[PDB]
Design a protein around this ligand. Structure first.
Ligand code: HEM
Length: 153
């Protein structure tokens, strides 16, 4: 696809839409995760011991917000510059995932959970050209974190 000026404009616009409702989009995102894969629950400190996904847990919200921010920032950086840049933060991210027991086959779980989350977020504006734009940005960012986990292990 690339990342035409016209595609990037379409990711920005759809991220602004996501941030606009963190407690919803973030608890949604954790349920689409547990639907695709239920066992994933024991991994998360704030989900252990619970029977259901807490809806107002600040620990969970702050956690899932930081996740989507990082995908969007990736798309713009691809249209301007042509790439996704690896920094300290992406590296520390790779360590914590490993401590907690996370693996690569967990990633399509979270991608489908994010495309389905953004198709749910943009509704009728959805275009091929947009799906094509977030797919390219997640795929490009996951490539980068998987790379750093492997390195934290
Ligand atoms: C591009 C994709 C991904 C991004 C951008 C991302 C980002 C993050 C961030 C930023 C943190 C730490 C947040 C904090 O300090 O508050 C974190 C923690 C964690 N991540 Fe991910 N993540 C990704 C994929 C995954 C996958 C595929 C899994 C597996 C299900 C996973 C499981 C976890 C767990 C268990 C923790 C620790 C939570 C704790 O017990 O408190 N992540 N992630």
């Amino acid at each position: 696809g690339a990342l035409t000026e016209s595609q990037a404009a379409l990711v920005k616009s759809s991220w602004e839409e996501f941030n606009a409702n963190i407690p919803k989009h973030t608890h949604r995102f954790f349920i689409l995760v547990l639907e695709i894969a239920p066992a994933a629950k024991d991994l998360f400190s704030f989900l252990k011991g619970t029977s259901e996904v807490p809806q107002n847990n600040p620990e969970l919200q702050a956690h899932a917000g930081k996740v989507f921010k990082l995908v969007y920032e990736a798309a713009i950086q691809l249209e301007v510059t042509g790439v996704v840049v690896t920094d300290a933060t992406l590296k520390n991210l790779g360590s914590v995932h490993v401590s907690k027991g996370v693996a690569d086959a967990h990633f399509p779980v979270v991608k489908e959970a994010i495309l389905k989350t953004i198709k749910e977020v943009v509704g009728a504006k959805w275009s091929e050209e947009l799906n094509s734009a977030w797919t390219i940005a997640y795929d490009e960012l996951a490539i980068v974190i998987k790379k750093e986990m492997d390195d934290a292990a």
